[PDB]
Amino acid sequence: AAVILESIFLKRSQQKKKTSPLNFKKRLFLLTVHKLSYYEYDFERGRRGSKKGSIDVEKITCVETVVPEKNPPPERQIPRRMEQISIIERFPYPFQVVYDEGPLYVFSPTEELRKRWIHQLKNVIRYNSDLVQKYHPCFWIDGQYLCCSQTAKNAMGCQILEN
């Protein structure tokens, strides 16, 4: 369909599979009313590459900011003070797109960008059937969730954000 948005972010490994590393990839993310998908980016040629995953827009229970990790390495750190480059190498503002399998973590290089996305994603998911009301505002890491130490990657959020 149409592309609502398209940006380059740094996403963390969903680690769907056991043997998978916890790592980050620069990916070109798209968004249609249908899905949220991400592809390898072919910078040389300038084009989207091989698809590396999607999440169907309707299976989405929730989308929000995530509490930034405490000691992020520079690729996701906030500087002090050339953007065109930085905006494709430094992604410090994460957010979370949660669904049945768990949460996909996505870092954005600017806030506005993150804002932009969360919002559309919101619009997009407004009438979904499973919009959860409790989420985890912290990352899932090393076996469990910081915020509540629960271990089920798709555990119930330990917090209700209600207006």
Ligand X SMILES: O=P(O)(O)O[C@H]1[C@H](O)[C@@H](OP(=O)(O)O)[C@H](OP(=O)(O)O)[C@@H](OP(=O)(O)O)[C@H]1O
CA 89, 94, 95, 100 dihedral sign is positive
Binding mask 51-80 for its own copies (x = CB under 8 A): -------------xx-xx-x----x-----
Q: What is the dihedral of CA 19, 60, 115, 162, to 10 degrees?
A: -120
Asked if 156 touches its own copies (CB under 8 A), the answer is no
Residues 8-27 that bind its own copies (CB under 8 A): 8, 25-26
**Which position has the token pair 């996403």?**
11
**Which position has the token pair 């271990």?**
151
Residues counted in the chain: 163
Question: For residue 80, how many C-alpha atoms fall within 13 Å in the half-sphere facing its CB?
Answer: 0
Asked if 56 touches ligand X (CB under 6 A), the answer is no
Task: Check whether 115 is labelled as a binding-site residue.
Answer: no
User: Which residues carry a binding-site annotation?
Assistant: 25, 27, 38, 52, 136, 147-148, 158
Residues of this chain that interact with its own copies (CB under 8 A) are 5-8, 25-26, 28, 41, 43-44, 46-47, 64-65, 67-68, 70, 75, 82-85, 87-89, 109, 111, 113, 115, 118-119, 122, 137-138, 147-149, 158-163
